[PDB]
Design a protein around this ligand. Structure first.
Ligand SMILES: OC[C@H]1O[C@H](OC[C@H]2O[C@H](O[C@]3(CO)O[C@H](CO)[C@@H](O)[C@@H]3O)[C@H](O)[C@@H](O)[C@@H]2O)[C@H](O)[C@@H](O)[C@H]1O
Ligand SMILES: [Cl-]
Ligand SMILES: [Cl-]
Ligand SMILES: [Mg+2]
Ligand SMILES: [Mg+2]
Ligand SMILES: [Mg+2]
Ligand SMILES: [Mg+2]
Ligand SMILES: [Mg+2]
Ligand SMILES: [Mg+2]
Ligand SMILES: [Mg+2]
Length: 377
């Protein structure tokens, strides 16, 4: 009989993981799973046995420091979407190509863009199956909502991380990931690469016609209750909206950053990486649970509950709301999040909140650059 500590990062999926653990326990009487919904928590001697983490810079730093088990050879890997596996490997924060190993399993994918209310689209005569293809059309849509008496955009600025979503959506098209290597070597600057994304994010939030400084929970509640045409968050937010209102008719769309309709890109990443503490005392039992979670049945059950994208080679989309972005995935017109290249020590969320509210692009760009420069030094 062993007790596993399961650190589960994702607020929106707390019940799903609680129930999955309980199901596993019923079938495996020799294993109890204690869920806790960060370096201190991840000291070797107390590292959780099973872990979910967002696939971001922080994951990559813990991976490079040896906190997580090395899954590179694991028999599970060959049934997974190679792009999602490669994203996880490329997050490892190392300058040595050979050290870009696999330190967790992609469990679920996301995309960043905007969630929209199809009934409000219908109300103003827009086609909810064919959202805007260009920046100009996207802005014209927001203006159409305002002119019809509808709040175009629900902001959630009181939760700073939410301001990263539009930046990442827009940067996906505007800024190739290769620019971050040039940024590190000093061959480009934030002024050159992020001025246009931040200007467009500021423009987007000029169409937030209600109070901007509300919380994530408040914004998703407002949206669920029909009071805004769009909420510019990624797919991870869908379950939070639908739990408030089962009946809301939602779509998810790419946020078009330019007027080149043929060269739009969808920001998409590894929303959940499932891993094991490298210094776990109970690796065999931990892996039994991980194998249970990584079965197609469980992955698809999760994807349905959470409106996510499964990590299997045959991709499954958990919600018909995701139909407008299916072509980006099919054509591989995707990009990882721009903020996965930004060290966790830089307070990008706080700088973005300030930029959106104040409009002061120069201060935002200078803050990012000066903090980046010091890290690279
Ligand atoms: O654009 C926002 C964000 O999207 C991706 O992360 C999705 C992740 O965001 C939220 O999780 C928290 C909420 O505090 O935010 C960090 C990630 O920034 C997570 O550690 C934390 O749990 C949602 O609540 C989650 O459901 C969702 O999975 C992207 O990877 C991030 O870099 C960032 O751009
Ligand atoms: Cl594949
Ligand atoms: Cl599907
Ligand atoms: Mg423990
Ligand atoms: Mg919740
Ligand atoms: Mg490489
Ligand atoms: Mg046009
Ligand atoms: Mg009005
Ligand atoms: Mg690219
Ligand atoms: Mg106003």
């Amino acid at each position: 009989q062993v007790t596993l500590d399961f650190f589960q990062f994702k607020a929106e999926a707390a019940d799903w993981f609680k129930q999955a653990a309980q199901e596993f326990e019923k079938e495996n009487p020799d294993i109890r799973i204690n869920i806790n919904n960060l370096r201190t928590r991840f000291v070797k001697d107390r590292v959780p046995d099973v872990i979910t983490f967002n696939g971001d810079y922080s994951f990559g730093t813990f991976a490079a420091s040896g906190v997580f088990h090395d899954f590179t050879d694991d028999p599970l890997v060959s049934e997974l979407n190679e792009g999602m596996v490669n994203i996880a490997k490329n997050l490892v924060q190392t300058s040595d190509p050979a050290k870009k190993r696999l330190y967790g399993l992609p469990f679920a994918g996301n995309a960043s863009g905007y969630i929209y209310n199809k009934d409000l689209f219908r109300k103003v005569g827009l086609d909810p199956d064919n959202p805007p293809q260009t920046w100009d059309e996207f802005i014209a849509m927001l203006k159409k909502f305002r002119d019809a008496g509808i709040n175009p955009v629900q902001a959630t600025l009181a939760d700073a991380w939410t301001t990263q979503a539009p930046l990442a959506s827009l940067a996906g098209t505007l800024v190739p990931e290769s620019e971050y290597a040039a940024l590190k070597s000093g061959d480009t600057t934030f002024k050159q690469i992020w001025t246009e994304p931040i200007e467009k994010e500021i423009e987007l939030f000029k169409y937030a016609d209600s109070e901007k400084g509300v919380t994530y929970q408040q914004g998703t509640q407002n949206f669920a209750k029909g009071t805004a045409a769009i909420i510019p968050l990624g797919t991870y937010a869908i379950p939070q909206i639908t739990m408030v209102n089962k009946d809301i008719d939602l779509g998810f769309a790419q946020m078009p950053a330019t007027n080149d309709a043929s060269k739009q890109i969808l920001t998409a990443g590894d929303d959940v990486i499932l891993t094991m503490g490298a210094n776990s005392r109970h690796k065999e039992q931990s892996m039994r649970f991980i194998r249970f979670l990584m079965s197609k049945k469980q992955l698809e059950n999760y994807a349905d509950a959470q409106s996510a994208i499964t990590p299997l080679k045959e991709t499954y989309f958990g919600n018909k709301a995701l139909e407008p972005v299916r072509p980006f995935f099919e054509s591989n017109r995707v990009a990882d999040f721009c903020d996965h290249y930004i060290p966790s020590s830089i307070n990008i969320g706080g700088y973005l909140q300030s930029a959106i509210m104040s409009g002061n692009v120069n201060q935002f760009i200078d803050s990012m650059q000066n903090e980046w420069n010091k890290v690279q030094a």
